[PDB]
Amino acid sequence: TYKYVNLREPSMDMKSVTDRAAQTLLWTELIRGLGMTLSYLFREPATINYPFEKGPLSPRFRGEHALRRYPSGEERCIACKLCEAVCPAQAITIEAEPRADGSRRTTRYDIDMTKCIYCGFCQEACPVDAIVEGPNFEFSTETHEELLYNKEKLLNNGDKWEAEIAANIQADYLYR
């Protein structure tokens, strides 16, 4: 099924020809366009008062990265390198070795936040919910070096955003 957008024959009776002459001479349809912008002047603007107000987000938002812990304080990551294999941008670099107690843990865990495309595949791939993308989106830096995160930065983000990262995972894990 199709419809025509601009297939019309204007009427040629003197009533209609004089209407179009009035529009041409009296600028009637241009003034009608001024009435549409006059109405907006008297509406409430959609602007929010950032930074005192913030735009709404959801529990699924993908922001700054963070490495999480178990409730005991043990790191969740067991250096399986699934996030490093799936990362479409190759932004994750991992080195691991047995820990002093024999556990499988990382010695290097860097995310180049300038290669990362903030896609979330790393948290989908992770089998222990170690690497997540948190809700923070306000971490712009003054240098390129501050955006090459290492394991210490990522563990500091996790200890900094656990209160809010845990709540978001609680509100979305049933959809995963």
Binding site: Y70, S72, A100, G102, R105, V128, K151, Y173
Partner: protein, 96 residues
């Protein structure tokens, strides 16, 4: 835990610290070295061993689907404690 080498520089939980004559220490002049003060190797050692009454126990890290894959830990050996390969919680059998 967090310790400082004989130059004032903190040592990370991986054991990393610049030698006394490493030029790479200049990056911390006027700035700081980021170290996490919550060493996980120490914290996991503070967890008491769980006393269970069966040969085989299962661990999912707590939280069901929010934990880690469910593994089963054998407890026959009475000289050591069965440790979880994912989360580090230790388990022992009830005196038999």
């Amino acid at each position: 835990g967090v310790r400082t080498s004989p130059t004032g520089e903190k040592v990370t939980h991986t054991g990393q610290v610049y030698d006394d004559g490493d030029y790479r220490k200049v990056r911390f002049v006027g700035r700081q070295k980021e170290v996490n003060e919550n060493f996980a190797i120490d914290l996991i050692a503070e967890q008491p061993v769980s006393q269970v009454g069966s040969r085989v126990i299962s661990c999912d890290g707590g939280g069901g689907a929010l934990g880690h894959p469910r593994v089963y830990i054998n407890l026959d050996k009475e000289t050591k404690t069965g440790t979880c390969g994912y989360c580090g919680l230790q388990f022992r059998q009830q005196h038999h």
